[PDB]
């Protein structure tokens, strides 16, 4: 348990009534990124949905010097403040890493979890990708807007989507509804990632977990998600075809139905 | 046939004896990019190999204001100067587009061709990618080196390669042997691409053609290569699994054996 933490106010929304589900967004994602595709489906299934702005987002976008354990403690504090322990947790990418590490140190707060687009370590390519992203920020160079959108398309969507002229046009426009500003908080979130080999620690997590991998994901490749599921004694792996790193936007029905079926299967 | 062309000296190498094969590199590639993996195999099969520096490369790296038809005429002039008509042609990406357009206007110069990683048009994503690349150059922004290498890795290699820690390390190092300097010639080569729907024109090409698509290619996706093969009355499509846009470096044995078997099958 943390002993060097200071609670800060994080924006959050608390919607619906019933069993609580805490959503943890990935790097650069605000709480509202769960609202186009996930929260309506979960509300329709009868869940209460908690979404929030991670440290480094929005009102804390200039925060720096925080670590994964800071964000774990932030999430734990939100669960305790809302008096929703134990909660279901849905995390994606950085948010799934936070969820994993939360379950290691405070398992009593999490009844079950979905971990989307996750890993328990970085391989050579993904370590290099992170070094390159940090180098881009630290150089002060700003990518021109269309080139930034091109990188976002390549890095987040399936080949099937890129080959779909209408879908591609739509996602280019979606980028205006979900800008990712280069902030100090975004740069610090880049380091809130597996710096070490965390799979052995996850063998201690006894709670039921669904790990979802996205077949075309190049940011968190599916084989690294399968490693997490294999470490988890009560974790199962599911792969979504024709889905990139943003698979929960790209194939929302497929992802939601898998998550809702899992959460129903572990009902108390 | 061209009527507004001026021949310029292009660097070239002419290796081996026997049936001639003219290699046409893609955007940013010098003639020597065919030497690590293709020319030795073709020499061992008994072919004479012509490799050259496209307009916009090397000694003409500051050239601008040229078009696809300029490069078609450059290639035709090289074939005629060396007195190797009709020649086999191997082109990749921009080089395959040049080869396609050469066969439309001067089919007598080409006995058969391999077209790797090609297309006869741009779809919505690939048009946007090109607009983004032009925007990056025209903005004067220079990508920091590690970020530039990250983009090159993501855009050119298969998921299988990216997941291979040793191979990834090797390709990062290969980038020091094959730098792609941002030059006026490189920017102009960006426009030497299908601006229009060229598939109907290719229905006129009677020569035998092998079109090779790379399964993981996101720069020239395989379905666009299959469109070219389908237009060509004597064109066949072959797909290489686990290969990105640089598939002829990544899977050299698979690509070379397919090309050599094809060229043997059409021997006079
Ligand atoms: Na498991
Ligand atoms: Na055909």
UniProtKB/Swiss-Prot annotation, chains A, B:
Catalytic residue positions: 93, 217, 245
Family named by the database record: Belongs to the AB hydrolase superfamily.
Keywords on record: Oxidoreductase, Peroxidase
Protein known as: Putative non-heme bromoperoxidase BpoC
Superkingdom of origin: Bacteria
Molecular function GO labels: bromide peroxidase activity
Gene symbol of the encoding locus: bpoC
Oxidoreductase is among the record's keywords: yes
Subunit structure: Homodimer.
Residue sites binding substrate per the record: 27, 93-94, 126, 245
Statement: the UniProt record of this protein carries the keyword Oxidoreductase: yes
GO CC list: membrane
PANTHER family given in the database record: AB HYDROLASE-1 DOMAIN-CONTAINING PROTEIN (PTHR43433:SF5), HYDROLASE, ALPHA/BETA FOLD FAMILY PROTEIN (PTHR43433)
Pfam families: Abhydrolase_1
